[PDB]
Amino acid sequence: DKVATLEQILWRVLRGNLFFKTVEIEQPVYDVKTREYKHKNAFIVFSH
Amino acid sequence: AFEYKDMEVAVASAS
Amino acid sequence: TELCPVYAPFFGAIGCASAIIFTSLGAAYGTAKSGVGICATCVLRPDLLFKNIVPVIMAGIIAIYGLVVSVLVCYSLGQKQALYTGFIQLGAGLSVGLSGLAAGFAIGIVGDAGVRGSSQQPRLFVGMILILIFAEVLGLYGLIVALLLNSRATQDVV
Amino acid sequence: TELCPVYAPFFGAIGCASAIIFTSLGAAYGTAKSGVGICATCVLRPDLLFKNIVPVIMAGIIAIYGLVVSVLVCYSLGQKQALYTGFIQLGAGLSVGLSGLAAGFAIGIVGDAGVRGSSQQPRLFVGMILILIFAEVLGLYGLIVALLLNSRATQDVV
Amino acid sequence: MTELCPVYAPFFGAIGCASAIIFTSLGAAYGTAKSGVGICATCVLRPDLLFKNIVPVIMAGIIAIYGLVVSVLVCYSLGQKQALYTGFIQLGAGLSVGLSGLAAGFAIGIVGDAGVRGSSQQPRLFVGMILILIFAEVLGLYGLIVALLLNSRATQDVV
Amino acid sequence: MTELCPVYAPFFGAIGCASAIIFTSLGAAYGTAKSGVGICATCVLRPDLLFKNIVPVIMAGIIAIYGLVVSVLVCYSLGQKQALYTGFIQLGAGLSVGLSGLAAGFAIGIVGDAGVRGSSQQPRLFVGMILILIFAEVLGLYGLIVALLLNSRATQDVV
Amino acid sequence: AFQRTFVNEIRRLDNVERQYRYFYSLLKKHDIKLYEGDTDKYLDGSGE
Amino acid sequence: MEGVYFNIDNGFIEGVVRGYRNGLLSNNQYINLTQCDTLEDLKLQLSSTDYGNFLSSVSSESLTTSLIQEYASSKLYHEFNYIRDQSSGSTRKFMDYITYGYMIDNVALMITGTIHDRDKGEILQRCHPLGWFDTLPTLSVATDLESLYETVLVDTPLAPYFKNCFDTAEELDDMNIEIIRNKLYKAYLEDFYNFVTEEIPEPAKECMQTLLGFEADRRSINIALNSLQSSDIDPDLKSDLLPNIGKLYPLATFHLAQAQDFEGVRAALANVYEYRGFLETGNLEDHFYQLEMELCRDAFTQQFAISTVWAWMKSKEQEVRNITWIAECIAQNQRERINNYISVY
Amino acid sequence: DILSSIWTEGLLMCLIVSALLLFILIVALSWISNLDITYGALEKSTNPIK
Amino acid sequence: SNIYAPLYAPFFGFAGCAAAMVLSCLGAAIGTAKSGIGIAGIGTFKPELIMKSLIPVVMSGILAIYGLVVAVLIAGNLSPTEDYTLFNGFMHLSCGLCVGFACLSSGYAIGMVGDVGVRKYMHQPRLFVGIVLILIFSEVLGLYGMIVALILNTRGSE
Amino acid sequence: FSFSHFLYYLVLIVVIVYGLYKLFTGHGSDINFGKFLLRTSPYMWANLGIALCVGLSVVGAAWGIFITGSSMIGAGVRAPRITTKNLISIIFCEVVAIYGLIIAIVFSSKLTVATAENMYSKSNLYTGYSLFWAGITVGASNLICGIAVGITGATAAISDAADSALFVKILVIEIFGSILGLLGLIVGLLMAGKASEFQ
């Protein structure tokens, strides 16, 4: 849900010099905090 | 009278 | 000649146009209204794409109904035809066109609701297919009425 | 002949098309307005899906009434018909069209409300069915007037 | 002039030749302006997907060519002394292509902007966008088939 | 018929006799409703000002009496064999009192609502809103005078 | 209702009912079927 | 008239919210709650109302005054979210406009809590779950406003309301955040009045105009009575905090913007008829709550109107304030002022 | 003594019936166009407070 | 034959009956429906005030009696055997329009004042005598319409 | 932009310019509404009366039914016992269409075939005029009656869900609102009383 929100916020912070990258996770990760299945995915952001 | 209560119609009926 | 006047092929060409115009105008609403909901719910669940493509296909069958009726009307026009043939051709155009328009509204709204609903509950998809079959026969009834009119256009015409 | 002029088939051919254009346009409203409430209800409780599809079926009977009147009226228009038969065919088509157009709207709105309010309070299924049966006999009343009026189409006309 | 081909008979053929390019231009204009705002909003964050997103505009450009084809086919059958039958046929062919292209252009714009906005967050929606844009492109193709069949007759034993 | 007294002539006096009572009833109804809404909303806290604040309803009921007077004076001039001149005079005499009474009814309704809602908070405002409602009522009287001066000429020196 | 007699027994017994509903809810998340003794005869029947 | 086209998409909503109205506690039920001895007696006595079996599955000894209002508020918020999921078109916009006023309070609470260096998780609780907006916890960074609006607030629906707010360019203290909150709430009340005027039909139009006028008047009086305290504000800098609607706007907001002491506020309200019985009293907010409840009761007489959705939502929130006030007196044995609840139904 | 040469009493009846049927069609499609979906029931929101 | 009595003159006389009944029924229904909303809106708070508050529902029922009297007097001057000149048809159209628009305006006024009067009656018991006086002033409009119609009805039937 | 208002203003401009042209040319009697009423066939007027009677009665019944039915289903979630109590609010809306059936049954017995000569006579034109306006009168009165009784039925359902002692007092208003359709029926049967068939 929150990949586009991160990428938009980090675009507006880093002024268009971001190197965002993401790869999906095909199985749902059952959480206990909430009680749904929650499709997640990875991210990496490069900055010095 | 008394009747059989069937717990699944009593657990969803409470909360 | 009081039964084949000069303005008699106006209504025939108007009906031949009206079939494809109103069925394409209904199919376009169904396709657009469904595809906005398909492209919105498959940014998260991309493996439901070829399963959710059903309401766009059922919206595209209506244009084939209009095409069949307008082709069959177009192969019966002529310069010296009667008013009776022209009135039958206009009625057969308007029936399939406006019934296909109604079925296109129904398919568009129910596809846009049901595709967005089937991503939360996986068991709703056969319910959407059950409702979309009841919307698809609303164009098939108008197809039947238009073909049944068109069969009477030249039978005892003098 | 001034008793059977040449524009006399027009009032038949637009009365036969009006029976299926107006009833399918009401069936589309009933089907879409009910199926949206069906797809919204069954996200949380999907075991009520094939029980709540009654107002989609019941809105599909009105298009059958329009199809029946369009078949009956199409079997009685010809080139040399009179104005008496032409205006009776117009009256039958307009009767079943205005009666199927409002019954479909009422079935849609009441079926939407009933499908949404049968999730909470499961006793409101019987109330929904009892209101929807009384909004289905209105298109029945138009069917009855159209048949009663078509019974005198071509019997003593010259 | 005479009874069967009067002097107001080339009026309908000129309305039919004009309205074939006009409503298809309206359809192409909606599909280009509506889907092209979604391109300029998407390609700020993802610039290298620019030429994969021009495909709704190429789909909208084909609809304007259909009206061009029908309008140049009708224009080489106009005459000072043509029948009312020919004017009616040319009017119907023009209206068929025009209003079918108008409906197809509305559908291509409304699917295309949401598809471009969606197929950048998800690189698997490109194929689905192409497929739904194919189903809305063939509507103008159906209108073109109907108008080519109408213009095909138009002079058969018209005297 | 006669060339000066055609058969369709008492149509016009039929539209003039009706429009004197149609449009004054709309003005009287607007004035009465728009005033009475303000009278009910004010007398919740001040019930002793109930009979003093009902003069906007009395000012708006005189308009219907104006229209009633004109409609019963036109009616004893209508006949089967009258002229077009008489029907034109009756049409104009109906329309003058009708639309002038509609305007007076709108003014009485608006100013009566605003003055009844304000006079509970200031007892020296009531004579000031009487003085405006005289100016809002003589408009219908001007329409009445024009209608009666017209009606005094619908039969004089005709043939 | 809080001033009637026999209200402390109701509080004790529906505390027990609350705990039994908690047990039945805890038989979810680990799919264990309830016993369901179908002998509805040793309580209700003839003889009353 | 109004009932001809109202029930096409709002009849089920109307019937459900009128049935919600019928569960409001009347005056005898608060007397029966007042007579309770312990808090379990309050639980049994609330079980015989339309709250019934909502403190089931808690305990007999984990029952606390905080937990009672937490559950009684969560019931209300689930009911609001149920009504809003069945709405479409204009009613959905009406209920989103109800939500924005809680979003503003969440924004001010998060920005204030960021300055005092406390935990993000404890500001994310006590933070009114109805105005949520998923990017809210991102407000715990970058303590000036220009790095808040340019990163996260432009995507919110609160973005049009930050127009009159950019006159500072520094970090924020407790005064500046309250100025920002008052300016946002001014722009919100004016925009929601303008939405009601152009788009809601008439018997709900006039009801929502007088209800939003009351809200604007109460905001104006509290801003005037919180600005004569230990501060120094230029009088034209205070007229930007008072909303442009209500029945005390075109004259009395000129005088409240210039009131230097407490007698300048009593002189400004002395001309308006519905007020000036308020500044000699016990509590001052117990006049506003009483008058709001008499306004909300009058809104339930209009039958084909969505103002009912407002009038329920403010009445039920009064009810959760009453029960807590009883539960704060039973758990602390402070029966002296226990009958000071506010009940109109 | 006829009505007209172009606005005859047979063209006018066809136009009266066409105008009535167009009026009913336009009113019905205006009812059709004001048809919404209530999107809030078809999705779900996180809200980690609740 | 008779130049003053053409054969289309019954059309306007029946349009008089239609206007007189339909617009009076509309005025009575607007007066009854808008007033009953306030009567049932006060019912949840003070139920004991309802049986006194049924004055505007009875005030608006007399309007349909005005239209009914004028319609049954116009429809008794119509016959396919009698003479029935155009003057009589123009008079009956004028009768119908007078009664109909007077009763429509009076019913609107009774509806507005009855709604706001019954709703503001649960707070002040002394406000009832002022409601009845404004409701008497709002009902004389339809009486004026009926007087003009009775004078025109006895004036054109000669 | 109010495009329908632009259509209204265009129609008004064309009507005024056309009538003013016919006056100033000298041919103002060419716009002859009386000759239209003698040359138009009486079967048109009779069948439009029958069709619009039953169509408008059914439309009013359906309108009143969804107005009362939506609120009755919404007020039954918390009080489900209002359902069978308030069914007669729907019964009053649905007898509106049975009156349209009765009128269409009475009037369709007069649709006989006339002869070529003796066609546009006084009696046949009278029968067309009477059936047209009688059908319009009973259909429009039944549309208005159905909508009014539907509004009162929705309000009575809300009041029954509030307090069950209120439904007896709100049912009185539905009795007043239902006499309007019966008066429409009486005037429809009386306007076409002396009208012969189409001999």
Structure commentary:
The structure is cut from a larger assembly and holds 3 copies of chain A, 4 copies of chain C, 1 copy of chain H (345 residues), 1 copy of chain I (50 residues), 1 copy of chain J (158 residues) and 1 copy of chain K (199 residues). Chain C has 158 residues and is mostly helical. Chain C has helices at 9-41, 54-59, 62-74, 83-117, 125-150. Chain C has one domain. Helix content of chain I is 46%, strand content 0%. Chain I is built from 1 helix and no strands. The radius of gyration of chain I is 25 Å and the shape is rod-shaped. Chain J is mainly α and 158 residues long. Chain J is elongated and about 70 Å long. The two termini of chain J are 19 Å apart. Chains D and K meet through helix 4, helix 5 and helix 6 of D and helix 3 and helix 4 of K. Chain I: Residues 33-50 are cytoplasmic. Chain I: It is found in: Vacuole membrane; Endoplasmic reticulum membrane. Chain I: It comes from Saccharomyces cerevisiae (strain ATCC 204508 / S288c) (Baker's yeast).
Concise synopsis of the structure shown:
By secondary structure, chain C is mostly helical. Helix content of chain C is 72%, strand content 0%. By secondary structure, chain J is mainly alpha-helical.
CATH H-tier superfamily of chain K: lithium bound rotor ring of v- atpase
Number of helices of chain C: 5
From the N-terminal CA to the C-terminal CA of chain C, the straight-line distance is 11 Å
User: How many structural domains can be distinguished in the coordinates of chain C?
Assistant: 1
Kindly name the structural category of chain C.
Answer: mainly alpha
Helix-strand topology string of chain K = HHHHHH
Number of domains of chain K: 1
State the end-to-end CA separation of chain K.
53 Å
Please compute the radius of gyration of chain K using only Cα atoms.
23 Å
CA radius of gyration of chain C? 19 Å
Described by strand count, sense and barrel closure, the largest sheet of chain K is: none
Query: For this structure, what is the CATH class of chain K?
Result: Mainly Alpha
Largest interface: D-K, 48 and 45 residues
What is the ordering of alpha helices and beta strands of chain C? HHHHH
PDB class: transport protein
Keywords: complex, transport protein
Entry title: Yeast Vo motor in complex with 1 VopQ molecule
Chains A, B, G: V-type proton ATPase subunit a, vacuolar isoform
